[PDB]
Subunit: 416 residues, 4 copies
């Protein structure tokens, strides 16, 4: 009722500036967010859960209740899912495989992910994938796909090749292509002599990894740059330019992670440049706090900036929105909830923007009006629209979702 | 009525989280925003209006309609003010003096600002002040208060001392202390051999500058650090530590400017630290875009963080909120309008935060709850309260204010 | 003799670590540095010299004696050149053409550069070139090649196409391909609604611009990204990713400018990545001080890192090294001299590095030894080798060159 | 002989510029470097060596041969020391205490460091100290001195109070005041509501901590700011402005750590500013690679700028020079060796600078000459001077020191 009313006023407000709230809602329904599985168990995986997170990535917090297997994970995920409106996907790491016996990374098969697949069907989720190139003895030296050792190198190439197959299976089975992201930790902590060679090896390996042609309808390859990681601060083989080059040249999708750049550097600006040259873009929304810290996505300037770009450019088909963060210092379900909802809220507000009007003002050099209007947009009643969206999707419109979280914690997590 | 309706709903939603919108509105009225006069004529001043803006500060845009004198300036200020709700002050620079004949800077008098004073009275505005230590032949070497030349030095000293008197005069007349900010461009463009001497001169100069005791009820001294300027990139005499030591040791107020720090550096963090050692703070809100660009303040992450800090700590008395930006690329009046409204919006929002609750959660280590709630606060109907605030002050609640600016521009600005 | 002695000692020291100083000297002779002409007259050019430097690029200092025509510029250049050992090139801007009557930018011709060419021949200098897309009426809106106006856009397109021909002309005549760099200021000061369209337009334009096939032996196209400029802080059409994609996909050269990235971002790291995708690199060495301030190049960490990368990779052929800075606050000749020699000193040091050994240690995981060695390199007697370099090229080995500059200043610059 | 010869040449060259190399050598011996003990055992300490390094501080590498006790530590220190020329000191942490039985941190005594002292006596070293406020159950919440719980708070206060007594004990016994630095990890990983209260508590605590007047001839109190740490990214109680204010207000010494600031921020600039307010400076030399990474100090731009400042200002008495870094990815002895020598190399180069002349050029506005000379200074034969310094101190002049380290590694480290 209050919502209802609030909704009506909003409807009218927006109408007056040429904005159709309904349509906005429809459109928001066309923008799924792929939730990252790893937020649930601290990137532990099911290969060897308790066995140090590596790659220059880190888990800070030790809050209790982490999931410890597929089952807990799925349960945790559903809980989160019920408190997040609209479309979602699940982004999986190869270490999240389910097998009675241990599987060599270079040997995974679709079969190791059937449960995930059946579950996804049941939950009306699309699935995404990622070879796991870290937290492994063969990753110990800080090199994987660029490793100078042929054999090591081969093992990683093989794992990647296999991963493409699982991914393709996901798309076959789900009817929506699985975006399979390649991220590797390869780099050097200190002053490096030869930055080239590794880059050369990485180039060759990737080409081999994507050599097998797969159905685009079921599978997409993406490469993700990174500036630096803890323990590999001075050099990253797979740098921004390297992958920009790579994706452009081999026509794979390019993954842009909001926490993987320089200080003050923003992927929102990159979206429009990159799409002129690469087929698709996988966007990893994450909050870096003075480093690639992986904090939870907030409804902030850059998250909003990113949404705007996607929406202004009508990137519904070519962009894949994913979360990329891991905060172990708080409730993990809450983490996914806050994150996802935030992304959606940024999206919605972008959908509520009178872009054409603004675009038109800009074209005319009416900078005064553009700024002004861009700013006014912030005090328009979008919240009302967001809450109607929640309501429609049977999701708590406000802070009440916290009680559910609290409740599940008490009831479940508390026992883990 | 829609407003009224929206207001009522909000009133209720907030109340449900323990927030009283009516009190909020009242509190907002206790937070004036000191608008910088220099935004109206591109820091031209009236001494010698057309005569290059110096000091490492720039004016970009050349948009038409700039004020050309006190009269235009006041008119322009008036338009702006009618479009901005609640309390405001006028922050004046010494070069805005009004004299039939030329006045040496080191000789200005209270009488050179009587009109400004009268006007202020009439408009119920408090006045703040600043000595002008740039765009002057004796500032051309890039040194003023720290100039090795005793005589040049003296001159600036004197100008400063005289400015304290003008400021005190304002306080006396207006019944509200004038905060007199001291900013100098002093620094070097390139690799510097001696960073010490200039700082030594600066320190001594300052002490001299403030040696005359004035009524604290009418006048406050503030000092403003700065990281770098165009043309003085390598070193700034009046650095952050410099003024922090100064203000702490001499007990003056400290001026913190949102555009005068390192990349990713934020004054919002600094507020709670500095208030433990300095009597008062002068806050310069500004948006630096890649440098001390002086862009209009937006309702953004930092402007909000700033507001929150002031409000959380109940800094009503010890904080002086001011704007410090200059964008000549768009309508000047709009520039002021957007920025002032934005500051006020941020403050309002801070006033609507359930801090005590939050504070309590944080103290108990409930970081899940704190984050979640901080975030949910962004989808609370604050805009309705803001709009009511506008209404109550007879100010447009939405974008309509542009029309006004537009019309003033046609009728007025168009003829300049 | 002292030099001789020091040299001999050095010769032996280096020999002992497997380094041949003689060979390094020879190598150094294979690495010209392209001097930027614009440092001589404050990017004034000869179209309309006194007529505001625009493009978000600035000239700070106002030191006296700037060159006022091609004659003075050449004289100044020669003086500089006699103080810089080894190979050099001259990098010209379109606005430095020499014509009795005005020439529309869109109609320049080889013939407008004949004297530069004859001079170059006589001075044994290769020539480089650049279209001048700024400081012009049709660049006044901040857009050139991405301008939405078809005709303006065409104009800049034409001007670039015409510049290619001048460029080829240089390569024909001099027998060394002229690298023709493309840099445009296009961007926005403030928050932008559409970053895509301008990139789209830029993309198409460049394509048209390079459509004419010219002889590689005489001509090379290069594109240069930029992060931001004064008066275009928020967005730059031709971003890093933009050109990275561009160069990669159209196989043009990619220009990496040391002052054009984010804080802490270094192109030295980008060299080995870009060369895997682009056929050539044009490197602009510059010292950005908190902004693309264009300070003189120092023998500093980053200039050395760039040097090392080129040398380590044996990029003698694919890399074009040039200067890109402008300091008008000191003697301009000295500016050139300092920067040029510094780049050469950085090169020589790189050439005196026992790379193989190091490379070898790194590949074995001997990071201890690597770090140790790299650092000890710094206290080896490279100064001696540099000084002998100077001597063999009949150039002052030390600070004495300043006398020369001072002398020219007195005799010539003093009367400008 | 070759050294002697190079030495003589250098001698002459520097004299020609008014620099006396013998005097330099002498002044260099007046500038000890305080080696941090913790690099040798990865901050393990002796309370509970194997028991996770906390505080937002990390140890990356796991290279073998870390010291396991005081004995190992001392032996390792000695090996390092024989490879580092001229004066050094040892900086101790409270966790390196030697006791048969466990000692609550709140009750340590001078007697728990007796061996250290006797060893220092025998090795002619001065000693520095630090309370350890991390890697402890009572520091698990991320708060220590700012902890809201009175008792926890009380424990850390007492620990600091007792550490002061140990420190004074060092001063007494050694005849040189021990500088006792106070660093705590206290901060928040995420968005914080109340930054004020912890600061107020910290303030009050520090005042209590230093309430006991000790003999300045034996002891000095220093406070160390920090910007952020892993797991405490968002807020740090003891910020730059907090400690600048504190040190200025209580007249303690101020610790500036080169890895503890914002990107591009440098302490070299801060020295001259701070010195005007605080009695003494504690300077931590460290290399932050994209974060407070704690990499080994290189002879780099900033290390050199710090040295230059100390020396230019004749800060021999008021500044205490120490190392603050921890790299566990390479041989720990070498880490110390590299960093220490690098710091000494930078100081020596500063000592060889013709400051007065340069100062004099600068004061006259001869910026051309200043830059030119500053830069020419880099090609002067400082290496020979350094190498003589090494020889006079019975230390390897070059890279040969690695063989000693390698040898120790084989004989001793290999068996740990
Ligand atoms: C676990 C995850 O794939 C990882 O974070 C990568 O995506 C990359 O962002 C690393 O910093
Ligand atoms: C004109 C005005 O005082 C000025 O901008 C200062 O406050 C400081 O920001 C200067 O760069
Ligand atoms: C004038 C000169 O070409 C210019 O500097 C561009 O190349 C680019 O560096 C912009 O600053
Ligand atoms: C362990 C050591 O004291 C520590 O490094 C502190 O001094 C501070 O620099 C934190 O990073
Ligand atoms: Mn990440
Ligand atoms: Mn400013
Ligand atoms: Mn530049
Ligand atoms: Mn540190
Ligand atoms: Zn990612
Ligand atoms: Zn300011
Ligand atoms: Zn350039
Ligand atoms: Zn430190």
């Amino acid at each position: 009722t209050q919502l209802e009313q609030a909704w009506e006023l909003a409807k009218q407000r927006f109408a007056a500036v040429g904005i159709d709230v309904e349509e906005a809602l429809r459109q928001l329904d066309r923008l799924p967010v792929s939730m990252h599985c790893w937020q649930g168990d601290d990137v532990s995986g099911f290969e060897n859960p308790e066995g140090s997170l590596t790659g220059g990535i880190q888990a800070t917090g030790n809050y209790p209740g982490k999931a410890r297997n597929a089952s807990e994970l799925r349960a945790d995920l559903e809980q989160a899912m019920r408190l997040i409106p609209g479309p979602k996907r699940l982004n999986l790491h190869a270490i999240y495989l389910e097998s009675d016996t241990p599987v060599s990374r270079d040997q995974i098969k679709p079969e190791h992910f059937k449960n995930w697949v059946e579950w996804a069907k049941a939950n009306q989720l699309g699935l995404d994938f990622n070879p796991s190139c870290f937290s492994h003895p063969l990753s110990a030296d800080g090199f994987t796909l660029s490793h100078a050792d042929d054999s090591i190198r081969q093992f990683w190439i093989d794992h990647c090749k296999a991963s493409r197959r699982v991914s393709a299976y996901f798309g076959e089975q789900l009817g929506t292509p699985s975006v399979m992201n390649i991220w590797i930790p390869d780099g050097m902590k200190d002053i490096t002599v030869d930055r080239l060679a590794p880059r050369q090896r990485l180039l060759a390996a990737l080409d081999e990894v994507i050599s097998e042609k797969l159905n685009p309808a079921h599978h997409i390859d993406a490469v993700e740059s990174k500036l630096f990681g803890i323990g590999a601060e001075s050099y990253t083989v797979g740098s921004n330019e390297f992958y920009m080059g790579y994706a452009t040249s081999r026509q794979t999708a390019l993954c842009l992670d909001a926490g993987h750049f320089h200080p003050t550097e923003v992927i929102s600006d990159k979206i429009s440049a990159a799409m002129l040259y690469v087929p698709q873009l996988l966007l990893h929304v994450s909050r870096p706090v003075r480093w690639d810290s992986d904090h939870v996505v907030l409804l902030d300037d850059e998250t909003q900036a990113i949404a705007s770009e996607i929406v202004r450019h009508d990137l519904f088909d070519r962009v894949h929105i994913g979360l990329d963060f891991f905060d172990a210092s708080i409730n993990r379900i809450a983490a996914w909830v806050i994150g996802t909802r935030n992304m959606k809220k940024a999206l919605l507000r972008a959908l509520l923007e009178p872009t054409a009007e603004l675009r038109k003002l800009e074209a005319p050099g009416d900078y005064t009006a553009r700024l002004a209007l861009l700013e006014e947009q912030k005090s328009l009643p979008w919240q009302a629209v967001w809450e109607m969206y929640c309501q429609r999707h049977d999701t708590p419109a406000g802070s009440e979702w916290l009680e559910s979280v609290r409740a599940y914690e008490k009831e479940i997590l508390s026992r883990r």
